[PDB]
Symmetry: C2
């Protein structure tokens, strides 16, 4: 509500000026609220940025869950998560531009590590258990595979893949190919 | 006679450091001269202002990347080994130069990491793709897509090594990222 307004303002301000240039006064300006109002919702910049990081990971998990179907073949589960990332990034240009900056958020590593049993980690376990995937760690598998969606995400490549979906399917299958046992 | 290139590199080296420790936004010429151990006069003579500095720095950054791809290149080896060399070149370069690794993200804000990049005459990657495609080895996908499916892993692994390792694992990634771009 007012919190998402402020988080959304954090993205924009983080995209337009650096993460280093954020202040509670500036964020209040950018969210079109008085300086007092922002402090009603967060005690300080650290807390705001902590909760912001948590909102970012919450979106990431949302994206991995959308139209999840465990009855489908593992490839089609993978294809679905790849497309969810793709289309999420198409729809959210400020988030796309800010992806690299999020790694500098103070709470980012500490939040990232403490997520047990997320949708990707479970997919890798099931898929390894069925004999499909390489016995490599889940991080390395991600980097060889779903990460290609983040790697490729740009405006010119949204246009190209929508015109030639053959290319998008090729990239999905090839990125899957990389993590086959 | 170019002690002028060496002095430029003295300043560029310092640009990296001040960019890695403080932000790119917080750069100013006074701060970069102190870091480089050059007089205020020297840096202002070399570069018209902060803009012209960061332009030339960009070009210098593209050059180091191109030189990294070229190191130990050998047409006579198989295309996989050429690719494996390039992977290792990137991996060990970024591990040896972590200050460069930090600034990778912030580099795209430089004028012009768009313009100066697309405009690269005879890039080793491009050339390699052409020879390997001509031989029949690689997917018929554009050179950037092929990169983003393959060598890109070297950069992503170095970068996320910090936020998340044995030699068999590195070879697995080299071989598997290669696998993604095979015809
Ligand atoms: Cl900054």
């Amino acid at each position: 509500d007012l919190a998402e307004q402020i988080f959304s303002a954090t993205d924009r301000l983080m995209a337009r000026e650096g993460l280093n240039q954020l202040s509670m006064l500036k964020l209040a300006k950018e969210a079109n609220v008085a300086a007092g109002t922002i402090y009603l919702y967060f005690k300080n910049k650290d807390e705001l940025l902590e909760q912001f990081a948590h909102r970012v990971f919450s979106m990431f998990m949302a994206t991995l869950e959308k139209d999840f179907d465990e009855t489908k073949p593992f490839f089609e589960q993978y294809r679905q998560m790849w497309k969810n990332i793709w289309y999420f990034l198409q729809e959210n240009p400020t988030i796309l531009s800010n992806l690299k900056q999020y790694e500098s958020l103070p709470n980012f590593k500490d939040i990232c590590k403490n997520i047990k049993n997320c949708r990707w980690d479970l997919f890798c376990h099931q898929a390894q258990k069925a004999g499909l995937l390489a016995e490599l760690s889940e991080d390395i598998l991600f980097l060889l595979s779903l990460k290609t969606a983040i790697n490729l995400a740009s405006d010119a490549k949204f246009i190209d893949f929508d015109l030639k979906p053959e290319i998008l399917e090729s990239v999905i299958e090839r990125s899957w190919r990389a993590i086959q046992k």
